[model samples]
Target: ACLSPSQLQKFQQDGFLVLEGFLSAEECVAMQQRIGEIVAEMDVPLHCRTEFSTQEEEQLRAQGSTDYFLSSGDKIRFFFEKGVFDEKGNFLVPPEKSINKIGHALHAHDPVFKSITHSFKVQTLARSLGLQMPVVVQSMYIFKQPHFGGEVSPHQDASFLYTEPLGRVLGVWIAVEDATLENGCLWFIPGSHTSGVSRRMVRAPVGSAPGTSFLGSEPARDNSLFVPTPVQRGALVLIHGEVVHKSKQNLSDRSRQAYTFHLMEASGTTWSPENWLQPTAELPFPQLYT
Candidate 1:
């Protein structure tokens, strides 16, 4: 099992858990190498990539162009940091500092990612956490580069990946390198998930005019209960979907790279059409146990 009873209890109380040395050094190095190879092979230009920010996303919705956000569910795409490009949209930083994440889909296409996603260790951990028929809905490689990685706003996972009655999704964030507060490590509010989902990030229904998306009412909560969490390389941080968490900006010279994936219960939950990301023909989000 990936966690002990004490650890499980901690997760039950805090909505998050940090497991040290969850991935072997060899495995971590393999994934890092694979990521490097893919980046080199793709040679994705800055123009073709998308940068993400709360304000930028709001602007995109206002402009009636939701294709990039909506169509990313099953694609291996890159998202740049907020300040990576200058006013003219030209990349003004190094590739490492410019790219924010390569995400939405990777496990389904890449052999290395597939192996990690389908690993027995992860499967066992999911089962132990009481995830019934867990399905991998999304995956990403977050690049918290030096001096430029933008701050991820405090939010719940369910806001973006909502399910019918809530509390079905689980996130496994594997640290590819040592995560430190100086390098934008994650911060969380203990037991925040117990209060349930705070906001609903909804997109237009299937038949609605395309590119319609909006945020629902914000739920009230005390912002003073946050706690910063830092872990070593190869550690795995498990996060509850309803948990309120965010990461700071990477201002240091070192990069904090991590591979993260989300799992949702597929047995009884309804993946609503209003949710932004939908499965496409090429990438039908697959279940862990079939």
Candidate 2:
């Protein structure tokens, strides 16, 4: 087994596991540099970008006003926090520092990101956790930017990267810097996975911009049931898809950078057509084991 008996026991019981130093300190620096380079090299027009708010998307999505937030499913895109811009969409902070996260398809397009996304150790761990044919479809580089970073409200991974029969999706979240309570480390409700996905975030119709819809309202979870998970740089956090977890806004001076991606069992499970992330003919999700 890739994990010790105790480790496996804890993961199954808790719906999450923390493995420290999954990436070396040097490797962590490499990720930051790559992120810096990507931001430094960005050429996106200011007008083309829109204010990205999860709460806002629920309203705008159905109106067919597909913002950069949803269209970013297959491309490398920058998403800014709601607090960073004024009502008129003016920037109050530096463009790069204000970015919320780079999402959806970094694993398919970026070589630097692809390296760790398809790591052999991760592949084996997926197998150990019952993934027969694993394929990674989406990834993210989260910059919990100091002071302006927004809260990632409580939700389960399966609510977005869902699969038919439900239990086959897995999330791999990595901390490239020190994650602390003040710096927006993850908080989880122990063993919440047993409760199943509380809500479903599915794809909207053909005309809906980026096409997303919610099946039910987000549950108001009790804070007392939540536990904070803080780890140093390079720690790997394996998350069960159904686990309810979230991170508060970064109010500290230090930035909490994390590289995260999701893997799905491809053999028997059906990838939902209503899912926002659909595989293209050119960039179809790869079977990592093959």
Candidate 3:
């Protein structure tokens, strides 16, 4: 649905918008069922299956390793949370509680996801937000399972999905299930986009293979400016590319499942090769409209 004038003004001021009931209950049910079926039957490739703890991921970053995370742009991958596996790599927790997120290429790989990404509602929203020739570049399903969902560090979308000069990426996060403060709801720094995309997550220098690091300027870190954004099932949350946002660990019994996809301005911004996610022939990102 297109945003109202007041909603647009609020989005411009807050760097994010929360649209309640953006998706119908029927749509949400169908999408969730489809995703469950896919997760049950799909045979994830070795490279596509990633299981690491939050601490392990942090260690990788400290060691300057980015090959696995960077190369996941156009793949149907599963990332497991830490503490779900024992030292011997055996499952210590059930599958439902183990997965951190399934991501990187849902829009390009699944028909259900594809439909939503290219839906008239999304297209209209993009147009209303003043995005020019927006293209769907990435999609993800975050599990945010009970008691195990790891906290996502605060960062900007443009850091990982960088474009030349400046990027115009829009994030559409759909709440498949209710997202509450007790279940790791999203938090944002209001009006952070006014500062623009200050930093970028990029591949390390030529010699530093398999390494990735953030470059350019860094955004402000004011905890007081952060505000919680809880959305009910079937709701949609729109995030600006430059906004600083994050989610806490799911310490409650409920699961905060969500579907997210990104749209970028296709005409002016150059999708730089130096940026980690490069689309290949087999799994190219789809243009929203011709």
Candidate 4:
């Protein structure tokens, strides 16, 4: 609920916005406790799995799974190595119970999130550029650790959702812990959203597909030319779908814990067949798409 007129304008123009002092230290601790409890209950590693064991891989595709760590041999390590965990080994999703409630709270607690997701800013920014009502989705949690923490790899929400052209997609990166420079903070390219163009690049092959070959790779792009936006805890960053951005590895001892919420226009509904890490519902969003 901590929004300013200037901040709002900046978000509209740059396709991204960062607001500090949105959450109190006490609140952060409470949410953390809740997440921890649920994570402990699950037997499977909380991180994304890499490398699919034939049958598992097929099953993943059939369900349209978005968890990358599931395919990996050591998903737990991948989560921490990828900068989604802290030095203490905490993950992005606070246990499970905490994540369940926290997911819904994001929309209910923050007015800025609501306004952007519901297309409330459309009237001021021109209806054509506005977002759709009742946001298509919402997400919570992005746990990253130092060392292995890699970038999110620049890609559009629609690419994963298989949605229509330039659908309204709003992402909120909320810091659960101190997301310092050493911990691989979120980096973005200013105003890349308005460019109205999608770039093409290369991604690693699926399973043991091959080495360096496009035999089983995914399409991606380079946003290295963009500027960097670093935010602190109790802060939230709002970004448009076209905005090119990614997260870097956490070089320091600290772990970066952030909850990312992806909200799309009401009419948005499509799944990306190329990238399989995006979930259709549940973990990615609190509600399901019909």
Candidate 5:
């Protein structure tokens, strides 16, 4: 989709933008069909179809019926971007429920996905903002339903991109199904990116207490008028590193599935918590050729 000049300006000033109907109806259908089958065999409940009848049920019951429930597995069952399973510890890949293969197959045949990833309008905008040669890192298929209602704790994307020198990270969330309040759509605080303070977030046992982490903590004054973004099947929502946003609980029976990808430019600064590599005087490159 072609972005109007004003639309690009808004994105530059606000740090986020929404492109409606970025994916075609056919593309959405293919994704839904493939993911639906893969999710059916997953041990973790699909969105809101969690089962308490398993052994873990007894464990929680023994603990005085704690409000929180643990995933029988540690990591979310996933098929990485390569459609290959990570055999490492805590990286459980269920053979029957793997969707990485499905995603790989779809990416091969789907024209719409390529179009959105390489759209001229988006490329021009990135160039205007000094980001060059940004590439897609991963495409994640998030399947959330009403039963999966939980607050996604506020966190910075920078924490996840320390290894990449490029601070020009961009992400797009595409809804495979209609995301509604009942199904937990996304909410964003506009201009919060420039707030300069990291929002406080508390780590707690899942389901122990709701809204306790971010409650009482004040958001940036500019974020007072936060907007709730409800997207349709074909809409794409773009976000920057500093955007403060969270997902709401899905109270409906239908699933709220979406795909997300991390995009980064070639020329940008990178830092890691562990300092994986040392930096030198010329480590960071100049962007302006002139």
Candidate 6:
């Protein structure tokens, strides 16, 4: 098994568990450099460059969630960092350094990322979780870029990629670079999974044009419940589906690059049709374990 009994117990109790040295030093460097190359080579036009910010006014949120974003479920795409553009719509930082994340289909499309996604270790972990017919729903190569890495609001994975059974999802968050306290590191509330998902992030109604919104109200939780979780490069973090997690902005000099993906049990569970990310023909939810 990828996780020992005690480790599994900890995850059951705390809603998250971290594995040290999940990737070798060389492997970590390779993935980091590859992401750097991809970011440098990306072709984001001025109009398509939508700034990503978690807190939103309804109008700005809809504007940012354009066709480029809504249609990126099966496609590998880049989202720009917040506050990188002025009122005139020009970039303050170079495009390469200003990327917020590359998302949705890295596991399905990229060679390096796909290899890890379908590896024996990951499959073993899925098997242990009783995910007989598991599918990787989404993958994100988060830059969490040095200076302008914006804050990710406190949320649960189940809120975004919901299933009928709710907690039938597992999140694999790999640290491609050292996640330090100075830089943006993940913070989580212990045992938040048992509290249930507070809200469902879904697509706007069919009658409305196009966008996303929260279906239910967010829960009020005490600030003292959160704990900062810093990890070394190559560490792997397993997050429970309903665990409440958030991260602060990176104002430090270092980057907290991470490659994260979510796996859902496709066996006896129903993937929410209202979820913002829908399976396309090319990405019919690739099997993590057959």
How would the candidate models be sorted by lDDT, starting from the highest? Answer: 6, 2, 1, 3, 5, 4
Per the 3 Å backbone cut-off, how many clashing residue pairs does candidate 4 have? 40
The TM-score values for the models, in the order shown, are: 0.89, 0.90, 0.87, 0.59, 0.59, 0.92
| Candidates 1 and 6, the one with greater lDDT | 6
> For model 4, how does the per-residue alpha-carbon lDDT over 87-204 read when each residue is reduced to its tens digit?
4334454333212212323333344433333333323332333444424354444556445445566655444433445645666666878876678777777767775534332234
**Selected candidate, larger lDDT, 3 vs 6:** 6
Separately for all candidates shown, the number of backbone clashes (residues 3 or more apart, or on different chains) is 0, 1, 2, 40, 7, 0
List where candidate 6 sits over 4 angstroms from the true fold.
49-65, 205-208
State the TM-score for model 1: 0.89
Q: What lDDT does the true structure give each of the candidates?
A: 0.81, 0.82, 0.80, 0.50, 0.52, 0.84
Better of 2 and 5 by TM-score: 2
Q: Which runs of model 1 end up more than 4 angstroms from their true locations? A: 43-65, 94-96, 217-223
For model 4, where is the 10-residue window of minimal lDDT?
A: 72-81
Question: How many clashing residue pairs, candidate 6?
Answer: 0
Q: lDDT value for candidate 6?
A: 0.84
Worst 10 residues of 5 by lDDT: 65-74
By TM-score, who's the top model here? 6
Q: Residue pairs in steric clash, candidate 2?
A: 204-211
Compare candidates 1 and 6 on TM-score and give the better one.
6
- What C-alpha root-mean-square deviation, in Å, does candidate 3 show against the real structure? 3.9
Best by lDDT: 6
Summing lDDT over every window of 10 consecutive residues in candidate 1, give the lowest-scoring window.
Answer: 44-53
Give the RMSD in angstroms, all C-alphas superposed, for model 4: 8.8
